[PDB]
Design an enzyme around this catalytic site. Structure first.
Site: not given
Ligand code: NA
Length: 129
Positions: A35, A46, A48, A50, A52, A59
């Site tokens: 990760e 991301n 969308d 968002s 992380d 998220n």
């Protein structure tokens, strides 16, 4: 901060993650490696809208508030900036909620795609634990 592998393992063990919800330590170390590369300050955007945050890439649509994710929740009661600290406490506490959400460690895509079904004990081999 960028953790060493056995340093992170030890930190995770102290915060109660070994065998949390039946996931051994190696699973978490493996998830953190893929990760974030053990880099607490990692961020990723991301499609969308968002982002992380942190060593497990938690998220903002569901778990933390970044002030820039419309209509999102803040299930962990924390600023997403709390996830970038050299102290992993807020990440580990939030992780515990996430793994409980019904899909286990499958919420972490890199766990599912790179750790699940492998000899994840490798990730803590050699470590004074
Ligand atoms: Na949010």
């Amino acid at each position: 901060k960028v953790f060493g592998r056995c340093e992170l393992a030890a930190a995770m063990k102290r915060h109660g993650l070994d065998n949390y919800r039946g996931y051994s330590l190696g699973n978490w170390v493996c998830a953190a490696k893929f990760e974030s590369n053990f880099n607490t300050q990692a961020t990723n955007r991301n499609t969308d809208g968002s982002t992380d945050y942190g060593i497990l890439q938690i998220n903002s649509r569901w778990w933390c508030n970044d002030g820039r994710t419309p209509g999102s929740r803040n299930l962990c009661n924390i600023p997403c900036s709390a996830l970038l600290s050299s102290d992993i406490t807020a990440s580990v506490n939030c992780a515990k909620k996430i793994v409980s959400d019904g899909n286990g460690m499958n919420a972490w895509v890199a766990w599912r795609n790179r750790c699940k079904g492998t000899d994840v004990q490798a990730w803590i081999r050699g470590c004074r634990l």
